[PDB]
Design a protein around this ligand. Structure first.
Ligand code: HEM
Ligand code: HEM
Ligand SMILES: N#Cc1ccc(CCNCc2ccc3ccc(N)nc3c2)cc1Cl
Ligand SMILES: N#Cc1ccc(CCNCc2ccc3ccc(N)nc3c2)cc1Cl
Ligand SMILES: C[C@H](O)[C@H](O)[C@H]1CNc2nc(N)[nH]c(=O)c2N1
Ligand SMILES: C[C@H](O)[C@H](O)[C@H]1CNc2nc(N)[nH]c(=O)c2N1
Ligand SMILES: [Zn+2]
Lengths: 411, 410
């Protein structure tokens, strides 16, 4: 079965045959589209087909499909499965898997870079302290004094689901959030709950507007532990505006390294519940969402106030005007400090080229339009006008529940 | 099977039961979501009666008369008419219910909070293109209302056997002409280029400017379509000025007041109305963002940027974005200053969230296409961006249909 997608600004048509290799489910049916819904142990019965599928894909890529080396590997794996009810990935396989999970991530506009990923094997790690050390090295490596490098650190896979490795932080670096007695929030409202956990776990909170949270790390299913990331490792950028001198006096800054740590990496049926990964920012993540979401730092009013905009009638588009200035400032700041960042015009543009390339050499590129189109200036980016097919491939990054909701506490 | 949608900016959760009564497909499956796809002959008589019955059942339910013998009476009456004439005719009341509910069910429409206040013009007695022109002039005049716009729809005779099709060949009653001129550049609207010269190809004489209102091309009873010019005094246009920059007038931009879509097909109880132009009023971004700034359209960003003397170095200065905002500020300013109806995208999305809360509470749900409801600029600072929505097809409905010229037997 063939499937065609059209770009309505260019009239470019592509043909998708990759969706035919789609395993997982979308959530959609013939009678309902769930395209804007935010959210989508294991036995031997189901494990070896998943393993075989992965190994078929792997040996295809390395042009050795049907080789003796391919057959032995399959033989090696199901025997290890029958014997031990799981199996171990070779280094080359783990690297292939991590890269393709990224490549398969339909919601990620940054996928043009998927082949260049630094994979850190942390499967030999046994304690929270060992986790902290690995994560420190990830951060230093990825940050690279502002010249950011994509990386992922992979901790041991789930076994019986009772000994999971987890990073309890949603991101390796993120600011604390403190609900005040009067209802107001100091810092990042997105992190109020997690902040409170840290505090209960023993974290002495500085209680400022931009406090970098401590790492909260769980190894082998034990209770998690607190660690402060060495400050000399946390790169930050003070936010200024190229023309607006008062903007610096807003007291804003952000950290340079986006490093997502709460997702689950699935490769050939194995589940890696701790797999922090990092790239670099698209400007709008900070300038639009982190700074201007009502449920976040929410600075539109204050910024628009000091711009002296007509703020009483929303038809003045004072919100829209302030939003552009803030995103200009975020970009200006990262560039002036020689910290890697990409504007949403450049990013969406490169993604169109990537997606085109992927249809040609791979037969498709799964893509979630709802997530790929930038949160401002949508129709003046080329992805807005691009039809996309959304489907799920493995290897993949999955969501998982928050560890505090599922953890059995030891004491 | 009893689904929940969450607003992530407010934590409000609505439970959807209405989706259960959906019948038509989405294009999606368990394996593939086609949510971002733009576009995913007459019916037999045993195809038609279940369609009739479903419609009649909900009509009589709506008027608190479900299971009444008056309900039963109408059912048998229609069944006999179908059995006999292989079709049937809508009562005036049913026709009005059908139209309002086709709008209520348009999951891509952000302005649906107004769905019940729709003026329905029954044009089912029309027999000629000249008659169509007349009905359409009255529609336009009524809808425009000297700037104080009023929602309206005009319904021409239903399809019969596909030979008697009434169609309006225009996509909107009012649109600007577009010509391919010698430089290889485009004067006027590039989106209408093909239509703009099917017009002269049948007799039009173009004033070859950049904002020439197109002639109506009307097709009655399957006959060859005919050209009629809308009386200029019926076409309300707004000169585009900016409230702070007054080099802006020199751009010489204008647009029309009345968005009136004329190429869709209205389905009611199995019956197909192939000519059913309807109109409401503009959301600001349709003009400022799409009509003016699309690369496939008037594409005026660079020009505007230049006059703002912005850093057009590379993309990172966000000059496109800065200009986009000013352009949309001017559209809203112009329309408002002429007291011509227009809604900004903040106001209209907030209206729609409230409409959702009304529809979930009184109807059990509200079908909604997130990809279309989110405005084409400033997406995440509108409430709808953070609103989960379920998309499904309810009938009565507005559907798409082939462009007439690709079908019409000459
Ligand atoms: C290198 C530069 C990169 C850029 C500019 C980029 C850009 C983005 C953006 C803007 C999002 C949407 C996030 C949001 O709105 O919250 C996203 C999502 C995502 N990205 Fe990338 N990304 C990059 C690298 C990576 C890497 C290295 C990985 C994994 C190894 C990755 C995997 C993902 C995944 C799995 C999502 C889905 C997020 C979710 O579902 O919550 N990306 N990306
Ligand atoms: C009165 C104020 C109204 C507003 C502010 C409004 C707003 C909108 C907007 C912004 C769109 C997106 C279309 C696009 O971007 O091309 C849309 C689509 C649509 N509207 Fe509404 N509308 C209004 C009235 C109406 C009326 C009166 C009807 C029918 C009687 C209607 C039926 C539809 C339908 C069927 C679509 C889908 C368009 C398509 O599928 O191509 N609207 N509306
Ligand atoms: N509430 C909430 C909530 C908030 C956000 C999300 C998705 C967040 N995705 C963040 C993300 C993931 C990967 C990235 C990769 C690179 C990059 N620059 N940013 C990313 C950002 C999901 C939920 Cl349920
Ligand atoms: N090509 C193409 C193409 C381009 C645009 C569209 C959408 C056209 N419908 C626009 C529309 C429909 C109804 C409206 C009602 C009110 C309003 N203010 N705007 C509308 C705008 C559809 C297609 Cl197939
Ligand atoms: C309800 C809706 O799915 C949700 O708000 C989505 C919309 N699209 C998004 N797109 C990106 N990149 N990031 C997001 O958090 C969201 N949020
Ligand atoms: C391919 C994609 O579906 C296309 O660009 C859509 C996106 N969303 C839209 N939303 C609205 N309101 N109007 C449109 O024309 C479109 N076009
Ligand atoms: Zn879908």
């Amino acid at each position: 079965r063939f499937l065609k997608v059209k770009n309505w600004e260019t009239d470019v048509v592509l043909t998708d045959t990759l969706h035919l290799k789609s395993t997982l489910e979308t959530g959609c049916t013939e009678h309902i589209c769930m395209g804007s819904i935010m959210l989508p142990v294991r036995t031997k019965d189901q494990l070896f087909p998943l393993a075989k599928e992965f190994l078929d894909q792997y040996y295809s890529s390395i042009k050795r499909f049907g080789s003796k080396a391919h057959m032995d590997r399959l033989e090696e794996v199901n025997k290890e499965i029958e014997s031990t009810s799981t199996y171990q990935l070779k280094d080359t396989e783990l690297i292939y898997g991590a890269k393709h999970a990224w490549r398969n991530a339909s919601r990620c506009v940054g996928r043009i870079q998927w082949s260049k990923l630094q994979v850190f094997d942390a499967r030999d790690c046994t304690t929270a302290h060992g986790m902290f050390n690995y994560i420190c090295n990830h951060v230093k490596y990825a940050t690279n004094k502002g010249n950011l490098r994509s990386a992922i650190t992979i901790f041991p896979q789930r076994t019986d689901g009772k000994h999971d490795f987890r990073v309890w932080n949603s991101q390796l670096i993120r600011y604390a959030g403190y609900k005040q007695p009067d209802g107001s929030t100091l810092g990042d409202p997105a992190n109020v709950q997690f902040t409170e956990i840290c505090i209960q776990q023993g974290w002495k909170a500085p209680r400022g507007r931009f406090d970098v949270l401590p790492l909260l790390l769980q190894a082998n299913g034990n209770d998690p532990e607190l660690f402060q990331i060495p400050p000399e490792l946390v790169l930050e950028v003070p936010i200024r505006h190229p023309k607006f001198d008062w903007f610096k006096d807003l007291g804003l800054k952000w950290y340079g390294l986006p490093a997502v740590s709460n997702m689950l990496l699935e490769i050939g049926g194995l589940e890696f519940s701790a797999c922090p990964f990092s790239g670099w920012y698209m400007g709008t993540e900070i300038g639009v969402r982190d700074y201007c979401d009502n449920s976040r730092y929410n600075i539109l009013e204050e910024v628009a106030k000091k711009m002296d905009l007509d703020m009483r009638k929303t038809s003045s588009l004072w919100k829209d005007q302030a939003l552009v200035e803030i995103n200009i400032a975020v970009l200006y700041s990262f560039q002036s400090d020689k910290v890697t960042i990409v504007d949403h015009h450049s990013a969406t543009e490169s993604f169109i080229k990537h997606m085109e390339n992927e249809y040609r050499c791979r037969g498709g590129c799964p893509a979630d339009w709802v997530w790929i189109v930038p949160p401002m200036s949508g129709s003046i980016t080329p992805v807005f006008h691009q039809e996309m097919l959304n489907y799920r491939l493995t290897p993949s990054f999955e969501y998982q529940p928050d560890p505090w909701n599922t953890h059995v506490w030891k004491g």
